[PDB]
Design a protein around this ligand. Sequence first.
Ligand SMILES: CCCCCCCCCCCCCCCCCC(=O)OC[C@H](COP(=O)([O-])OCC(O)COP(=O)([O-])OC[C@@H](COC(=O)CCCCCCCCCCCCCCCCC)OC(=O)CCCCCCCCCCCCCCCCC)OC(=O)CCCCCCCCCCCCCCCCC
Ligand SMILES: CCCCCCCCCCCCCCCCCC(=O)OC[C@H](COP(=O)([O-])OCC[N+](C)(C)C)OC(=O)CCCCCCCCCCCCCCCCC
Lengths: 50, 380, 157, 187, 101, 318, 59, 43, 49, 35
Amino acid sequence: LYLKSTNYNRFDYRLKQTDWGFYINNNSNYIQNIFSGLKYIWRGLRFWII
Amino acid sequence: GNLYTWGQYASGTGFETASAVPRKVDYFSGNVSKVAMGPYHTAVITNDGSLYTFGWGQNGALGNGAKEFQLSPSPVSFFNDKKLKVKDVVVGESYTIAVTENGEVYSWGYGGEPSSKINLDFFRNAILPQRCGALGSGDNKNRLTPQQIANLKADGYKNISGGDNFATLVNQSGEVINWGTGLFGSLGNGSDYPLFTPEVNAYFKHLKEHEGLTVQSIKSAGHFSAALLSNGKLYTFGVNTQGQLGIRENLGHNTDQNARLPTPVVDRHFVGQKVVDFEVGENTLVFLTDKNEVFFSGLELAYQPIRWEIPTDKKIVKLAASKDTFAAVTETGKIYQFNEFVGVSTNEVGNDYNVADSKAFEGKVVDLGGSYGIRFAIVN
Amino acid sequence: DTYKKWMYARNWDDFLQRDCKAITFPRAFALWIVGTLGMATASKWCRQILPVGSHGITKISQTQFFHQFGPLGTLGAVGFYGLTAYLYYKTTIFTVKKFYSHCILQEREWIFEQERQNPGYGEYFFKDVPLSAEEHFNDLARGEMAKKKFEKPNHEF
Amino acid sequence: NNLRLKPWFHWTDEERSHAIFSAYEKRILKSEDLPSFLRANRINNVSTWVFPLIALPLFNQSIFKLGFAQRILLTRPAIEWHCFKIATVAASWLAWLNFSPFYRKLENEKEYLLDTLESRIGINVLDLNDALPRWTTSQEYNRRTQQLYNQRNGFFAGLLYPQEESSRPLVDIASFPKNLHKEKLTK
Amino acid sequence: RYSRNRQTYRTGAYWCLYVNIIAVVAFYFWFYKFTMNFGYLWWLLYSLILSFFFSRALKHRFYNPLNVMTEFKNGFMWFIIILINIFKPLLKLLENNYINL
Amino acid sequence: MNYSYKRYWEPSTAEVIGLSLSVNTISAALTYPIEFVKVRSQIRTEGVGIRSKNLYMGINPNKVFREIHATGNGLRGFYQGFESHLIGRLSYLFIRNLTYKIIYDRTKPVKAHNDLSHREKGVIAGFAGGLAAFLTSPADLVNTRTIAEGGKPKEWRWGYKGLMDGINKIAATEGGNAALFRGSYANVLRAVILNISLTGPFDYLNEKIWITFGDMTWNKYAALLWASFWGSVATLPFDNIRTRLYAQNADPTKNRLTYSGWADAAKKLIQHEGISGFYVGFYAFYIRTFLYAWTTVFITDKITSDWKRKAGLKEWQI
Amino acid sequence: ESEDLDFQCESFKSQHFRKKGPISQYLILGLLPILYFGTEFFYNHYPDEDYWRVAHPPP
Amino acid sequence: VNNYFYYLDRIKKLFTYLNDLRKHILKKYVYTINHKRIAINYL
Amino acid sequence: FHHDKGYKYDVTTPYDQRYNYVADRLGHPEILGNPFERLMRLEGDIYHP
Amino acid sequence: CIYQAYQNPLRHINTGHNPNNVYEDIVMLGDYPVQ
Ligand SMILES: CCCCCCCCCCCCCCCCCC(=O)OC[C@H](COP(=O)([O-])OCC(O)COP(=O)([O-])OC[C@@H](COC(=O)CCCCCCCCCCCCCCCCC)OC(=O)CCCCCCCCCCCCCCCCC)OC(=O)CCCCCCCCCCCCCCCCC
Ligand SMILES: CCCCCCCCCCCCCCCCCC(=O)OC[C@H](COP(=O)([O-])OCC[N+](C)(C)C)OC(=O)CCCCCCCCCCCCCCCCC
C-alpha cells in the first residue's frame, strides 16, 4: 500500500512553514508504527470503559 | 519533436478518451515547436509556423468559427491560408492569442458577451464589475475567428502570457501591457476595472522609474500571476485560492485571500538567493533559485515558498507546474515530480518527491508544460 | 410508556414542525440557513480530517488520518458526513414543502394566524361574526352540524 | 365522502404498517385480508432495490449521452463524471421512492386494510397505534406481518408459533375481575 | 504578598447565570407548574439555534454564498471518492478469485 | 382583528380623487418650506457627512432656515420650485390613487367589516406608488434641482424658472426624454418604501393604545406620531439617495461626487459619510411627514365623516 | 490570551482610566421610571385590561 | 488603487469594531471582578 | 521593544543559541500530544506551542 | 477577531477560542505530530 508513497504528509509542510523547533519532520517510512492512533485511543478510554 | 499528452480529461489532449499515461501525439511528425495548453483546449505551433488548435471550441475558440468540440488536431485556416507564420501562442480558459513573426497580435474566443438575454446582470453589475475577456477588441463580443488586436505590436518582446480571462505582454524595454479582466488584482495594475483595450501597466512603470526594477518576465495561470523583476525576486498578484502567491507570513492567518498589487513572496526560506526562473500552474508556483534550489508554494500545502528537497547534485534545467502537480527536469533528463505529473513513477522515492519513469516517452524530454489538468511533453 | 421513545418526534419533519416550532415559512427558511451553515461546516471538517482530493491526494491510504486510525476512522468520518447530509436533505425537503404550501398555495398555520389577529386583550366579539364568540354562534348551525350519526361496526373477528 | 377525516388521517407510513401488524397479531385481521397487501409489499421491495439497476443503463442511453453530460465527461476529471452520474441516479432514485406506482399501490392496500379495521372495530382502530421505536420502519413492520403470515399460514403452527384461531375463555368482561384497578394498586 | 490574581471570572459569571436559571425555572415548575413557552419569542430560540453553527461557519467564511456552494461540491466529491475507493477492493477480490480458480 | 374593520361606506373614484387633490394641495403648501430645508440639509453634506459628536450630531434645521432667510428672499424664498413640487405631487397622487382604487375594488373583501391584510394592501400601495413615482420622476427631478441650486456654485446651477421650462431645458440640453428620468429608480424605491412604512406602524400603535386606554381621542394622533417616526426611519435613506441622484449635474466636472446609479450613490455615501450619513435632515423629514400626515388625516376625516352622516350611517359605523 | 503574561506593568499609564462616552444610553436611563411603569401597568395590562381604559357604563 | 469595494472596507471595519466592542464589554463589565464596576452594576 | 510594557534590554535569545537538551537520550513524546487527544481536540499544557 | 489578525496561531493549540474568520490551527483536524 505504501510502495511509492513519500515520507512527508500535509503536517510536514505545515511544520516546515512554522518556527516550531520542538517538532521535526519524519524522514523514514511509517509502516513500522502504522495504526498507532488506535493504540492511543484505547489508552485514552482504557479506564473509562467499565 | 513528437508531442506527448496526458491528463485527467480528454478535452485538449488531441484524443477522444482520457489517459493518465502519456500518449504520443504523432499527427505532427516530430515538427512540434511550441505548445500552449489552456484548461480545455490546446494550440500547437510547428516548425513552419503553422498553428493547430484543438479541444473544446467554446465561445468561438479554436479559430474555426464554431462553438463545438474538436478533439482531433486541426490547423487554423486563418493563418495557414495566408501562410502567415505564427511565432508564439497563448491559450486561456476560452480564448487564444497568436503573435506572428511580423509583430502583429491576433486574438479569438470569449470576450465577455452575456450568454443569454435573460440573466441577473442588474444585481451583478450593481455588485461586481462588468465581465470581460482577454481580447483586445474593446468590447465584450466573442470572436469566432481570429482577429487582429488593434494598436498592439509584439516584436522583440521579452514574454507574453495569459490567465483564464486576462493577458499580459512584457516588451524588450520592460514595459508591461495588460488587458482583460483585472478583478482581484489579476493584472497587478491596482484596479479592479476591466481593460477592454490593452493598456500600459502603471505599477511596473512606477517601479522602473523610481525603484529602477525592470520586469524580466511574467507568467500567469488561473486568476493568479507571478512576475520576475531585475532583482532576483518574485512578485505575485491575483487570487490566492490555495497558497500559490506565497505571501503568508504567519501560517495561521487567513488574510491573504488576494493581492491587488504585486507583493513579493516570503523570502524567509531562501534569504540571500536570487530566483533564476519560475513556473506558474493553476494552484501552484514553482521557482528555481541560483543556488540550484527549487522552492514551491500552493496545493493548499505551502502558503509561503518552501524548499523542494530533490537532490541538488544535478543542475535543474526545466520546471513545470500544473493542477496539484509539479516537476523538475535535470541535466540528465531525470524528472522529479511532486504528485503524478507524468503519470508513471518509479520505485525511487524521497521525502517529498517521486521520479517519473523514463519509459513513458521514447526519446529525451525537451519540454514539459500544461497548467490546468492536462499536461504535455515535447520529446525529441 | 415503555420507554420506546424519548423525543416523541416521529420523523425529522415532526421535529422541525413541533420541537423547533417552524410552523411558518420564515422560520423554516431560517432553520434551513442554519442547516446549510452546519452542513458546510461538517463538509469542511470531513475534508480537513481526511484530505482526499485536496493536495493532489487520491487514495485514503495516503492520509495521516488513515495512518493513525485506519479504516475505522474512515468509517467514522463517512458516517458523520452521511448523517449530516441526511439531516440536511430532510431539512431542505421540509423547507421546500413549507415554501410550496405557505408561499405558492397561500396556506397558513391558522391557529397561529388567529393568535396573531387578537393580541390577547382585544374587544372583537361582534354579532355580525358567527365565529367571533360562543354567544354569537347561531343555534341552527349547532343543530345542523350534528344531524348525522356514526356507523355501528360489525364485530366480525 | 372525502370531507370526513379518517381516524388515521395523520398517521405516518410506519404507524399505518404497525397498526396493520398489530391488528393481524391480535387476531383482528384474518389471514384472508393480507394476501393482496402482502403481495403489493413484496413488489414495492422489488420496486426499490432494482430501480437504480434499471436506471443505470437507461441513462447511459438517454441522459448521459446528451450535450451537457458529454461536456462534463470531456472537460472534467473522471471523478467528477462519476460524481455527476451518481448524483443523477440518486436524485432519480429519491424521486422514484417518493413517487412510485407500486408505492401508491402499497399505500392503497394499507388504506383498504385500515378501512376494514374501522368497519370491524369502529373508532377503536385508533387503539392500534402506539409510540413506535424511532428506527423501526414501515418496511420492517410489513416484513414482520409477512413473517407472522408465514408462521401462521404454514408448518410449525401450533408447534413453534401460536395458531391464528383464538381460544380465549368466554366470560362477561363487565363482571369478570380485572388486573388493573382504576386508581390504586391491588394485590 | 499575595500572588497575581486573574482579573476576569467568566466561568463564575456563567455559573451564576445558571444558578439564576435553576432558581427561576425550578421554582416555577415545582410550585406554579409553569414552563416558559420558548416558541412565543421564536427568534430568541433561533438565536440559540443559530449560535451553535454561526462561529464555526464564520471561521471558513461560509457567510459568503459562493464558499457554501464550493464546499458543497467539494464535500460531495469527497464522499464519492471515499465510497468508490471502498468498493474497488471488491473488484480486486474478484480478480484474485479468478486467479485462485 | 380581521372582523374589526369598518368599511360600511366606500367613497367613489370621483370623491377620492377630488378630496385627495384638495387636501394634499393644502398639506403640501403647508410643509413645502420644511421639505426645502430638508433638501438643502441633504445637499450641504454630500461629501462631508455628519461631523459633530454626541447631541450635536446632524444638521440643525433652524440653522438652515435662518441662512435661507438671511439670503434675502424672505419666506417666499422657501417656496421656490413649489410649482414643480405641487404638480409632481398631484400627478403622483392621481396615478397612485387611481391604480390603488382599481386594484382595491377588484380585490377588497365582500363583507364591510373585512379588509385586506396590511401585507396585501402594502403590495398594492407599493406597486401604485412605484408606478406613479416612475411617471412623475421628471417633475420631482426639476423640483429637486430647483431646491438644490443656491447651495451650489454659480457655474453648477441649472436655472429653472418653472416645471415646463425645466423639462424643456433638461430634454434639450442633456438630450432625449431619457434625460427627464434621471434617478427615476431612486424615486420608485422611495415611493415603494414610503407607501408601506406608514400604514403598518400606524395601525399597530393605534390598536395597541385602544387596547390599553380604551376609546380616547388622542390614540390616533399618538399612533400618527409613531408612524411618522418609523416611516421617516425607513424612507429617509432612499430620499437621500434620490436627492443625490436628482441634483447630480450632467457635466462630471460640476459635481462633488459622480454617481452612475442608485448602487453607486449608496456606495459613495457609505464610503465618505458612513451609515449615519443617510439620516441627515431627519428632524426636518420627520416634522414634515408628521405635519403633512396630520393635515391630510384631519381634513379628510372631517370631510368623510360629514359625508357619512349625510349617507345615514350610524355613529358606531362612522 | 495564553501568550500574554498575567502581570502588572510598572508604568502608571497602564492604569484603566475611565472616560465618558455616548449619551443616548442615558436618554434611555432618564426615562427609566416612565418606561418601567408603562411596561408593567400598560404592557402587562395590570391589574386588568379594563382598569386603564376610559370608563363607560354598561348599556 | 481603484478598489471596487471601498464601502465594503468601511463595513468590514464596522463589523470588526462591533466584535471588539462586544469582547470589551464582556471582559470589562460581565466577566470582571473589579469591585468598582461590580458596585456600579449593583447600583 | 514593547513601548508600553517592555524595556530596551529585551533581546530574545535565538533558538540557535538556546541550550540543547542533554540530560537524557530517550525521547519525550508528551510534547507531541497523542493521536487520541489531538482527535478529541483536547488542549494540554504539555504540548502547547 | 473579525477581518483582523491579532492573535498568533503559532502560539495556540486551538484557534477558535473566540469567534473569528482569520485564524487557522497549525495542527489541523487531520494532523498528528508523531515520533
Ligand atoms: C470500534 C471503533 C472504536 C473507535 C475507532 C477509532 C475511530 C476514530 C474516528 C472517530 C470519528 C472520526 C470522524 C470525526 C468527524 C469530526 C472531526 C473533527 O475533529 O471535527 C471537529 C470537532 C471540533 O472541531 P473544532 O474546530 O475544535 O470545534 C470546537 C468545538 O467543537 C466548537 O463547538 P461549537 O459549539 O462552536 O459548535 C457546535 C457544533 C457545530 O456543528 C457543525 O458545525 C456541524 C455539525 C453537524 C450539524 C448538522 C446539522 C443538520 C441540519 C439541521 C438543521 C435544523 C435545525 C437543527 C436545530 C437543533 C440544533 C442542535 O460542533 C459540533 O457538534 C462539534 C462536535 C462534533 C462531534 C462529532 C462526533 C461523532 C463523529 C462520528 C460519528 C459516527 C457515526 C456512525 C458511524 C458508523 C456508521 C455506519 O472535533 C471534535 O468535536 C472532537 C471530538 C469528536 C471527534 C471524534 C472523536 C472519536 C474518539 C474515539 C471514539 C471511540 C468510540 C466511541 C466512544 C467515545 C468516548 C468519548
Ligand atoms: C406657531 C404660530 C403661532 C401663531 C399665533 C398667532 C399669531 C398672530 C399674528 C401673526 C402675524 C404674522 C401673520 C402673517 C400672515 C401672512 C402675511 C404675508 O402675506 O406676508 C408676506 C409673506 C411673504 O413675504 P416675505 O416673507 O417675502 O417678506 C417680504 C419682506 N422681505 C422680502 C424684505 C423679507 O407671505 C408668506 O410668507 C406666506 C406664504 C406661506 C408661509 C408659510 C410658512 C410656513 C412655516 C413652516 C415652519 C418653518 C419652516 C421649517 C423650520 C423647521 C424645520 C424642522
